[PDB]
Amino acid sequence: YIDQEELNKTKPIWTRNPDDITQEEYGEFYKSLTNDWEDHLAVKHFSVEGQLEFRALLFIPRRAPFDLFENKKKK
Amino acid sequence: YKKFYEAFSKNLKLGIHEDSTNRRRLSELLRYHTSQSGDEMTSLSEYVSRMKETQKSIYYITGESKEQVANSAFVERVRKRGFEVVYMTEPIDEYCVQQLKEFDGKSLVSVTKEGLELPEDEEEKKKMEESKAKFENLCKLMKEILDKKVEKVTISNRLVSSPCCIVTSTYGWTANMERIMKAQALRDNSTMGYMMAKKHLEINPDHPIVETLRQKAEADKNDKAVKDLVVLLFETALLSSGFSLEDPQTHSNRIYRMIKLGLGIDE
Amino acid sequence: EKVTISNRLVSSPCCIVTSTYGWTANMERIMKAQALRDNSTMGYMMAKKHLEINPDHPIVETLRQKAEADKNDKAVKDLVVLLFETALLSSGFSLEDPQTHSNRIYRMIKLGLGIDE
Amino acid sequence: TKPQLAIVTQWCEGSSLYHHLHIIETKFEMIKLIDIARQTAQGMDYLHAKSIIHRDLKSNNIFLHEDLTVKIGDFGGSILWMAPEVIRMQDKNPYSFQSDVYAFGIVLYELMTGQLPYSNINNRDQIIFMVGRGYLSPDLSKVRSNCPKAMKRLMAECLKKKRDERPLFPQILASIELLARSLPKI
């Protein structure tokens, strides 16, 4: 037999209080978005609780992606 | 077909690059200018008609301008024997010729690929190898003064009216795409390290200059004059194959150095 | 098109300049040397050029005092075209026929070596 | 006067593999070799996952593209080293996944090793007659010093009695991934 719970292991991250956040956890979360051997360089978190409601999270990779000169692949 | 081919040739030349199911079928709708038709395009399929018997594979060249390639230093040997060649002088022509490598049992080989040889009469073999076995020391001692730029210098058969020329290697890039890549806008700058093609120099032991070098070679072991003459001739040869120098002042000074002797008194 | 004198040179006999409405050397080269060039019409439109001379390098002065004597001389034409082409090469442009160029330098060095025949 | 906008490229050619085996090495640390192994194993597993045969994976059929990336070729170390299953010409269908598994094993082992087995004695007719009766066994002295324990155990366990009870691909992949992510330094 086998029991496999790892189908969901990455906890959602864009909901917590911005102040209580360290850098390492950003590190592990960024690891499990693109399988690689490196960390990020900068991050950005904010939100706009206006008449529109939403939130966003952005990263800045260290090394440029090698495949950006395509034309119409699935972006 | 003349008015059609002048307009939408870009589409076919691109399509031949990226497709696999239908490539052999598309290998005949191309029209080129050959060295038997002054101002008329010639089909390559119809070209398959008239070749010699012992010959193998089609011969071709790629250049930058029609006239610039029309009279090139390499050709002056393969043109005297009555063969037939074609000119693909356009950036996409390199893309087409790079991928396609065959046509109806034949091969596509260009002039500047690691010293091509053509079958011919027997008696020329012995004199050429005599030049091989007699001119080993000048070929030996010239590599010392030239540091690690060229790979090898030899005597081959593409030169009848020019002393020197430059040819590339099989595993590597070619001269015209060396400029298609620099002229390309959105590209990385880490790729030049690896697949630059190593360079080969070719000498002609017919021009009296090379023989005049021999007397000072066995006469003087080394001095300033040999260094000056060799760097001058090499830098001139670098221009001969469409290569662009990195320090034009260095050669401009060397060309201005003697025009002052032309009228006499420098000082 | 035009020939004039300006203040841009200290040690060069001549240099080349572009028009106020015209692509520079590197721009024209990079534009024409790229695939899908579509050179059918746009290619035969741009790259106007001019010329300048410095009145300081004694070569131009001796050239002028030679030309003031003979008005139909022989060495004047090949000398001037040689200077024109050398400035052309050492300015970012590309020559039309390198073989003739190399031939001129080859004959020059040969005659300097005094070979003849 | 009627401006423009930038234009992009198309793509570039990669280099081969087998050329690297004899002439030019350009040796970095073996971590790159293990990375090559894991990408190529993943790729061939994906290919075979759709019940797809290959019928050959000769070491020349690999193009080393940008960085270290394998592209599998088809057109023209184990080019003469397949099982006598090829020599079997009974029922005209000896083809099976077992030959592909064994060929991948020997090819990757030699690619790690870096040099050719069986280069001293070469007699095709006598080799095949000896295959008929008196078949040989692989040499054991020809082995690398730093042979990883997991890979050594896998390759030893692959062929014991019959070349038919070989394992199935993803547990090989799991062994690859555990051995890779079990010895960076700690």
Swiss-Prot record, chain C:
Q: Which residues carry this modification: S-nitrosocysteine?
A: 15
Chain segments carrying region Interaction with NR1D1: 45-117
Q: Where in the cell is it found?
A: Cytoplasm; Melanosome; Nucleus; Secreted
- Modification note: Ubiquitinated in the presence of STUB1-UBE2D1 complex (in vitro). ISGylated.
Q: Which residues carry this modification: N6-acetyllysine?
A: 49
Q: Which residues carry this modification: Phosphoserine?
A: 94
Where in the chain are disulfide-linked cysteines found?
Answer: none
Question: Which residues are modified to N6-succinyllysine?
Answer: 2
Name what induces it: By heat shock.
Q: Cite the domain annotation text.
A: The TPR repeat-binding motif mediates interaction with TPR repeat-containing proteins.
According to its UniProt entry, the function of this protein is described as: Molecular chaperone that promotes the maturation, structural maintenance and proper regulation of specific target proteins involved for instance in cell cycle control and signal transduction. Undergoes a functional cycle linked to its ATPase activity. This cycle probably induces conformational changes in the client proteins, thereby causing their activation. Interacts dynamically with various co-chaperones that modulate its substrate recognition, ATPase cycle and chaperone function.
Similarity comment = Belongs to the heat shock protein 90 family.
Q: How does it assemble?
A: Monomer. Homodimer. Forms a complex with CDK6 and CDC37. Interacts with UNC45A; binding to UNC45A involves 2 UNC45A monomers per HSP90AB1 dimer. Interacts with CHORDC1. Interacts with DNAJC7. Interacts with FKBP4. May interact with NWD1. Interacts with SGTA. Interacts with HSF1 in an ATP-dependent manner. Interacts with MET; the interaction suppresses MET kinase activity. Interacts with ERBB2 in an ATP-dependent manner; the interaction suppresses ERBB2 kinase activity. Interacts with HIF1A, KEAP1 and RHOBTB2. Interacts with STUB1 and SMAD3. Interacts with XPO1 and AHSA1. Interacts with BIRC2. (Microbial infection) Protein on the cell surface interacts with N.meningitidis serogroup B adhesin A (nadA).
Q: What is this protein called?
A: Heat shock protein HSP 90-beta
User: What organism is recorded for this protein?
Assistant: Homo sapiens (Human)
Q: Which lineage?
A: Eukaryota, Metazoa, Chordata, Craniata, Vertebrata
Covered range of the whole protein: 576 to 692 of 724
Swiss-Prot record, chain D:
Instruction: Give the residues annotated as active site.
Output: 56
Mutation: residue 75 to L; reported impact is: In CFC1; also found in colon cancer
List modified residues, type Omega-N-methylarginine. Answer: 133
Cellular location(s) = Nucleus; Cytoplasm; Cell membrane
Tell me what the record says results from residue 133 to K: Increased kinase activity and stability in response to EGF treatment
Domain called Protein kinase: residue spans:
1-179
For this chain, the site of the Glycyl lysine isopeptide (Lys-Gly) (interchain with G-Cter in ubiquitin) cross-link is 58
Summarize the PTM comment.
Methylation at Arg-133 decreases stability and kinase activity. Ubiquitinated by RNF149; which leads to proteasomal degradation. Polyubiquitinated at Lys-58 in response to EGF.
Tissues expressing the protein: Brain and testis.
- Please give the clinical condition linked to this protein: Defects in BRAF are found in a wide range of cancers. Colorectal cancer: A complex disease characterized by malignant lesions arising from the inner wall of the large intestine (the colon) and the rectum. Genetic alterations are often associated with progression from premalignant lesion (adenoma) to invasive adenocarcinoma. Risk factors for cancer of the colon and rectum include colon polyps, long-standing ulcerative colitis, and genetic family history.
Protein family (similarity comment): Belongs to the protein kinase superfamily. TKL Ser/Thr protein kinase family. RAF subfamily.
> What is this protein's function?
Protein kinase involved in the transduction of mitogenic signals from the cell membrane to the nucleus. Phosphorylates MAP2K1, and thereby activates the MAP kinase signal transduction pathway. Phosphorylates PFKFB2. May play a role in the postsynaptic responses of hippocampal neurons.
Oligomeric form and interacting partners: Monomer. Homodimer. Heterodimerizes with RAF1, and the heterodimer possesses a highly increased kinase activity compared to the respective homodimers or monomers. Heterodimerization is mitogen-regulated and enhanced by 14-3-3 proteins. Heterodimerizes (via N-terminus) with KSR1 (via N-terminus) or KSR2 (via N-terminus) in a MAP2K1-dependent manner. Interacts with MAP2K1 and MAP2K2. Found in a complex with at least BRAF, HRAS, MAP2K1, MAPK3 and RGS14.
Q: What is this protein called?
A: Serine/threonine-protein kinase B-raf
- Name the source organism: Homo sapiens (Human)
